Automatic annotation (TrEMBL), chain C:
<protein>
    <submittedName>
        <fullName>Fanconi anemia, complementation group I</fullName>
    </submittedName>
</protein>
Amino acid sequence: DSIFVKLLKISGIILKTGESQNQLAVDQIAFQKKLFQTLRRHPSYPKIIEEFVSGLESYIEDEDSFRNCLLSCERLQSYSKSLIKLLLGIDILQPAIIKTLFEKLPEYFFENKNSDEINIPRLIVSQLKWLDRVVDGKDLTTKIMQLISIAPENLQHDIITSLPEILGDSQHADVGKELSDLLIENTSLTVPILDVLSSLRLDPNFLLKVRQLVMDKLSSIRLEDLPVIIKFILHSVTAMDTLEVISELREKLDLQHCVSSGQSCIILLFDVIKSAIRYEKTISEAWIKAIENTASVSEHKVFDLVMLFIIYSTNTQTKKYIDRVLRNKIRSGCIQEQLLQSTFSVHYLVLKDMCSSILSLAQSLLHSLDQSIISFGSLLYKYAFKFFDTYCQQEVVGALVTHICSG
Amino acid sequence: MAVTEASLLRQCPLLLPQNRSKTVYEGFISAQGRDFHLRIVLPEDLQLKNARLLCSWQLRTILSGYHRIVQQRMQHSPDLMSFMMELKMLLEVALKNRQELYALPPPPQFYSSLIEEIGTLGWDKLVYADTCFSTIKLKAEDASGREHLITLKLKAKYPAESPDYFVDFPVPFCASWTPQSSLISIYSQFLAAIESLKAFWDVMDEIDEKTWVLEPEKPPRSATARRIALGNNVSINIEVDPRHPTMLPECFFLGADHVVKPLGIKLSRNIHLWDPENSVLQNLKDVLEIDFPARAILEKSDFTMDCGICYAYQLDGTIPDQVCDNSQCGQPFHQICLYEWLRGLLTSRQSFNIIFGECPYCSKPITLKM
Amino acid sequence: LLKAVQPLLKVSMSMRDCLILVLRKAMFANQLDARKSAVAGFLLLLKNFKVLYNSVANETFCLEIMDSLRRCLSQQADVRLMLYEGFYDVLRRNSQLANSVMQTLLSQLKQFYEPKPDLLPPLKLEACILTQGDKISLQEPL
Amino acid sequence: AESLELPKAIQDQLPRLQQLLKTLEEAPPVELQLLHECSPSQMDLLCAQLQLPQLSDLGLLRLCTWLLALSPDLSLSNATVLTRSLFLGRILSLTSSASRLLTTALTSFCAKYTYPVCSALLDPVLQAPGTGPAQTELLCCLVKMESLEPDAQVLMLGQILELPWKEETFLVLQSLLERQVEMTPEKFSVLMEKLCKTTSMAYAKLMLTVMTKYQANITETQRLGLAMALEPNTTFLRKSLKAALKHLG
Ligand SMILES: [Zn+2]
Ligand SMILES: [Zn+2]
């Protein structure tokens, strides 16, 4: 009886009640152009859209009918798209359809897997994807920005990741702008944000701003995600910025702050870093430079040694560089022994699987002069035998004996 | 209020003066909806360094453990207001620790609706109820007919809150509790969690029946890792995905460095022939290209399968797994006994996590990986 | 690489799942070779696997992949070329989605084929070549 | 100025405490068990004497650890005073989101001493002007605490009620009632009363969340006051609210 249902029926679609899929009489384009030219030539020409959409919303007040409108259709001539998509292919209703779509979804925050175990809101947004034609692209943007500012977290986490299917190629700058303007506010949600920002078409000057932003918001993150954030950073870094970002990083990472209270994540972090500096080189030379030129600092933190070990264990061309620098900071007295104490009192687990590095180093430490160096190497051998396993202990004894007999 | 002609009411409305001078206070004190008797007599001045304070014997039993804290706080407090505030905070923490003393149900909510919900579930799913009506256990059936029981702990008023549910199967059971969710709601949730890992059981019961299954002896439903005997003094172990059970589980062999050797060599060149559509046992019989001893002797001691160091089977549940790489010995050993023996030995040289040394029986090279 | 690591993916499950996510993100990536290689990986996946957990989720997810690919047709020439090169082997394994495949091919075909006799250019060939500022290129190798 | 005499033993252990606090910049001694000796005013003086707000974050964390390790629990008044001297400056100093240190230390200190903790923290932070988003997010994570136990959530709510409600109050309360926390009828009455009074979009979220969840608690006159506050089009989700309001009826 509605303008709406009559127009669809003449345009050649079976308005199934909403238990099974609605059937289709004609081609998609056939029906679309049919109803298009119909209401085009139709009198009451601008108001008929308001009448159409009012009848629509009045129809989809019901759950299942709405559900089946959302669902894909059925052919008679053998699996098609959905009515909503076919309708939103039309631009002259689109911004109407768009508006109508949002302001009802809030009902479906606390609806969750009733009958067919299929989640309405996700299914709604599904409708919005790969839109060939978008008149209302910018207004759409502003509306989903209202939505994204308000959204409950999970929904938020979903729509946000869904975003690049939804958008096009034109309107992303202000999008990212609003995103960072959200990120300054909230830091629980970086990771999706970050994936999306990797996904979208951007300028990098904005990425830099955001990078600095997170680097400020870098002690102010929970434990778990931390690693992937850093992962992002180290993906994001380049040939030139590297030094400075690392400096900031080396300044902002603490590792006395992170307390099953920090262990698994720390580990995973180190792994990540390990992968990073495996699958590129210049990270290491820059990193060294950064702790090397940290010369005035007598307030050296734990991290540095740990990373030194690691780099010694990994790519080896620089080993003599590492020795050299480590001798130099030792003679300078910037590196000392309560350092090594707390280093092996906590982060040892990282080092167990590179114990052989420690000894190959201590070997080159005791062959030098300058008692403090020799004392350092001693402590190395000592803790190595102390915390690690039998094979380590054995290698300790076997290296000391060599020192004795030969040295 | 800031003034104690109103703040005294706002915080101890139950605690009020008798005497003309506001020096004799009596009344009650609220705590977890429990009004405890109290009589409190100040000096002429409003100094708490002396403040006579008697109670119920109820209350003195409950404060056995803090009368020294009372002596402290009566004398250290600036004002009766903060004194009583800290007192109530104290009472709450006391009962919080002594929370084992607490339950009483409302019948017409509870004892009415609960048997309607039992008739809703089925009286034959009903396996047990508690004399408290605190605990109740129920039965679910896998479509094969495996019984999966589950226990439920009921509060004073049940549907208001979640009951405490305790289930056998390994994955973390999630019960979406609304007050609209009833016994059959959680039962359907129980079934849906069962029907997710259904096809896992269909391979597990097959393996339980067929082959010389070793070391989840009497395997429960929780068990996702199994152990099977084969050949002689060579055992395999399996761990299966409940979600893709017919998918290749991760496995390895225990036994000899000449019996386990070509077994993996066959497996390497027949795993590609793994057709996940068949049963797991059937896939194995062709992948490994062998038949099992299908309970061929199961649990009957011919002295073959024995440690030779401790002379025992299932040493702390540890199986005779480490063997000799020798046709003449084939003496199987545990891990711990062989380790401790090759510990003291002089020839026993230690690599990363390996101990080499002579087999105790035959004095041939034997390798132990920890 | 992916041809090489194939057999691990045959046996394994979680690796296939994570790799799927990876390709998903790779398709949107602002590079070109990102989309190229994500396409190739999807092609290899679907060619080598009937199943990639109810088998209807496997089928509708294959359909999701193929719809993403159907739109990835809109991309430049070499992408669509890669698609065509794969599709024969795709069907040689998996006949079950012949309809979803051939519908797609035929749509793109009709988008450059005219259905009238006695019109002596039966196709549209300026349609297959695009020029933006006198820089000219093929699109959609017929 | 007041001539508050700290206990003499406390004045004499003052140096031991002041060196220990300095050392934690790098288990509990009895130096902390001495704090049983004070009345809460003496504690207030002592905190200023010891330069607690002048600490670093890490030291704040170690101290929180020790104070949580403490045997018989700190008095309400004392613990409050401590909390103020400990966090309040840094909190109100925050331009931006709190370091994880402060975050986690707070969470723990709440998680044990939650009532005094938040009675100290919440009221002044939100009565304060320029109460920026950073601080709201900390309080949001406070109410998201799995360790924030049920009766704790109720006292949090009960304390929130008496305040001047603004955008920040609504933003907090949204996350607070995402827990589906229990309300007495008088308390739900005060809720809906304040809730009636108004264009704010988080406030829209608030009204929506109540209408959706605590429909079990909602009556016709509450639904009417709802309708009155719902009439605005400066609102968003108008439609959704109208559908929810219909569903209440
Ligand atoms: Zn043994
Ligand atoms: Zn032997």
